Structures are given as structure tokens and as C-alpha cells.
Design a protein around this ligand. Structure first.
Ligand SMILES: [Ca+2]
Length: 223
């Protein structure tokens, strides 16, 4: 997250870190057994880390739970990032508590102009590299479909939305991929892609989770 703030320990209790020997992507806990992330974050060998603040220090509220199964969307296209969504099942249910909590899935799609909370342990620099240890947060508005398409001509599908600031300076970034975009208390987006981070006229692009609620529900009913 570039241009964000330190969230505060465990104030985003649905945020997970996906670990394969190192943090590599975020995700969101949607119930005691299941995480939603980006399909482009697929790796074999995922451990889900819940209750994290500093990902490099064991502080006492963590739950580390291996994935048993990962399910990339059936129509994920890794070239365009259309349908950039994945489900990860935990080998055992998380113990839900004040610091490890699920986020609701949406009923309706979010509205342009809504300010959402985006969070992660990704790079904090637009030019260069610096990865934080503690979780960072950003409030960013959903942009109109016409603005998003103007920013990325011939690249935005109905399963994507843009959020952020066209003047640059505030965005998600590498290592935030897969993490949450929460709008009116529901998971509306997944950190998916963008050209660079926090560059002028190149806002973040996010998987539009409201398009996937029936897939998510039937998949969790069946696995
Ligand atoms: Ca930790």
C-alpha cells in the first residue's frame, strides 16, 4: 500500500497473509474454513496466517493454518486477469475471536464514489521498493466505469472496477494482491492489478466480488 497508514494491530481482523515460506499475497477470511484471494496469487504449498499484524514477529494472536485445497475460478484468464478470484480452504477451522473474524460477502454491488478500505503488506513505494512488516491501510473511492475504462482502454471487463486517485500517490501495490477491498462493511473487491503503483492516471484495478457470490456459495457448499 502506497500512501496509506498503519492500520493498528488486528483492526482488520479478516485480513490474512498467504505464506509459502514468506508472505506473498493477501486474502480475506469469509468464514471459519475459507479465504478469498486472487487467482494470480495461486501457489502450491500455502499456509494461511490469520491474526497477523507484524508478519515478521510472532506477537501472540496469530493462527497459522495450512491450506487443504485451493480453487481458482473456472474462467480465470491469467493473461487479462478476468475472473481473478480464488478460494482457499483451511485444513482446520479458524477460531473466530476479536482479532480473527470473517468479512461478509456482498448482496449488491458497490456504488461509484464509495470509499473502501484496502489493506495489505505490499510495497509502500511508487518508485522503488520497501515492504512493511506491519499491516497498512488505505481508504480509496470506487471510480466510475467510464473513468476506469479510459484509464485502461480495451482492458477492463465487467468483472473489474477501479479504485483510487487519478492524481497518483495512493494505491495498493505488489504484495497486496489478493487482499480485501471492503466497502460498507462487505468484501467488494480483491487487489488484482494496475500499471505500476500510485502513478498518475493508472488507478488500481480490483476483482468485482459481487459478480462471484453464487460461485463462492455453491463452491463452499460442495467442498
Ligand atoms: Ca506476527
Amino acid at each position: 500500500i502506497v500512501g496509506g497508514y498503519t492500520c493498528g494491530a488486528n483492526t482488520v481482523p479478516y485480513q490474512v497473509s498467504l505464506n509459502s515460506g514468506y508472505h506473498f499475497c493477501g486474502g480475506s477470511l469469509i468464514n471459519s474454513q475459507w479465504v478469498v484471494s486472487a487467482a494470480h496469487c495461486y501457489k502450491s504449498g500455502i499456509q494461511v496466517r490469520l491474526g497477523e499484524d507484524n508478519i515478521n514477529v510472532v506477537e501472540g494472536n496469530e493462527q497459522f493454518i495450512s491450506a487443504s485445497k485451493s480453487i481458482v475460478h473456472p474462467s480465470y484468464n491469467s493473461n487479462t486477469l478476468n475472473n481473478d478470484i480464488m478460494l482457499i480452504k483451511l485444513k482446520s477451522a479458524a477460531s473466530l475471536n476479536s482479532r480473527v473474524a470473517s468479512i461478509s460477502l456482498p448482496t449488491s454491488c458497490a456504488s461509484a464514489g464509495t470509499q473502501c478500505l484496502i489493506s495489505g503488506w505490499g510495497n509502500t513505494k511508487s518508485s522503488g521498493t520497501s515492504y512493511p512488516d506491519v499491516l497498512k491501510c488505505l481508504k480509496a473511492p470506487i471510480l466510475s466505469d467510464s473513468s476506469c475504462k479510459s484509464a485502461y482502454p480495451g482492458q477492463i471487463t465487467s468483472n473489474m472496477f477501479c479504485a483510487g486517485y487519478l492524481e497518483g500517490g495512493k494505491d495498493s501495490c505488489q504484495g497486496d494482491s489478493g487482499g480485501p477491498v471492503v466497502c460498507s462493511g462487505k468484501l467488494q473487491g480483491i487487489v488484482s492489478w494496475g500499471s505500476g503503483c500510485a502513478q498518475k492516471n493508472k488507478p488500481g484495478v480490483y476483482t468485482k466480488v459481487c459478480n462471484y457470490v453464487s460461485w463462492i456459495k455453491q463452491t463452499i457448499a460442495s467442498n
